[PDB]
C-alpha cells in the first residue's frame, strides 16, 4: 500500500533561484556544500528530464550505502519537482519505491515555502516507521540549509 507523509518548511532564498540551485543542480551542489551528508552523485542515464536516473552515495558510517533516484517530472514554471527512490538503501522486499513531490512557492518577503510529499509504496504487510521518515526529513533539511548558506555567500551563483 501507500503511506503518505507531508511537511512544509521555509527558505530565505527566492523560489526560482532556490529551484535552479537546490532542485535542478543538486548533482553538483550537494557533494560540494554537504560532503558530510552526500559523498557523490552519479548520473546513470538521461539528460535531466523524466526518466533520468541518479545514484546518490552516502558517506561511510551512514545507514545506507546509496540510493538510486529517478526523475519523474520537472515543472520549471510552477517550481514543481517529482522524483522516486527506486533502488538501494531502504528499497527491497518490504519497500518498492518512495515517490516524492516538492513544490516551491514564493513569499512576499522574498523567500519561499517548500511543500513536500513522500509516498512510501510498500510490499506485503509492512509498515513505515516514524524514525525512517524523520531521518529523511533531517537529511532534506540539512541539504536545504547547506544550499541556502552557499547561495547567501555566492551572490553571482544561479541568478
Ligand X SMILES: c1coc(CNc2ncnc3nc[nH]c23)c1
Q: How many residues sit close enough to ligand X to count as binding (CB under 6 A)?
A: 12
CB 153 within 8 A of CB 16: no
Q: Which is nearer to ligand X, 22 or 127 (CB)?
A: 22
Q: Which among 141, 156, 157 has a CA at the least distance from the CA of 29?
A: 157
Tell me which of 83, 120, 150, 158 binds ligand X, using CB under 6 A: 83
Of residues 51-110, those binding ligand 2AN (CB under 6 A): 100, 102
Sign, Cα dihedral of 71, 126, 139, 62: negative
Sign, Cα dihedral of 74, 15, 105, 118: positive
Binding mask 110-139 for ligand X (x = CB under 6 A): ------------------------------
Q: Interface with ligand 2AN includes 118 (CB under 6 A)?
A: yes
Q: Give every CB contact of residue 23 below 8 A, 6+ residues apart in sequence.
A: 74, 79, 81, 102, 104
Q: Interface with ligand X includes 71 (CB under 6 A)?
A: yes
Segment contacting ligand 2AN by CB under 6 A, of 4-12, 38-46, 59-67, 72-80: 4-12
Q: Is 9 exposed, middle or buried (0-12, 13-18, 19+ CB in 10 A)?
A: middle
Residues in contact with ligand 2AN by the rule CB under 6 A:
5, 7, 9, 100, 102, 114, 116, 118, 133, 136-137, 139-141, 144
Amino acid at each position: 500500500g501507500v503511506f503518505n507523509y507531508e511537511t512544509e518548511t521555509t527558505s530565505v532564498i527566492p523560489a526560482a533561484r532556490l529551484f535552479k540551485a537546490f532542485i535542478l543542480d543538486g548533482d553538483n551542489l550537494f557533494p560540494k556544500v554537504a560532503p558530510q551528508a552526500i559523498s557523490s552523485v552519479e548520473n546513470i542515464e538521461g539528460n535531466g528530464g523524466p526518466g533520468t536516473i541518479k545514484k546518490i552515495s552516502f558517506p561511510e558510517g551512514f545507514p545506507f550505502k546509496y540510493v538510486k533516484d529517478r526523475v519523474d517530472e520537472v515543472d520549471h514554471t510552477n517550481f514543481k519537482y517529482n522524483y522516486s527512490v527506486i533502488e538501494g538503501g531502504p528499497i527491497g522486499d518490504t519497500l518498492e519505491k518512495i515517490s516524492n513531490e516538492i513544490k516551491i512557492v514564493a513569499t512576499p518577503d522574498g523567500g519561499s515555502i517548500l511543500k513536500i510529499s513522500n509516498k512510501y509504496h510498500t510490499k506485503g504487510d509492512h509498515e513505515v516507521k516514524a524514525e525512517q521518515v524523520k531521518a529523511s526529513k533531517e537529511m532534506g533539511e540539512t541539504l536545504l540549509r547547506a544550499v541556502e548558506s552557499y547561495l547567501l555567500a555566492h551572490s553571482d551563483a544561479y541568478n
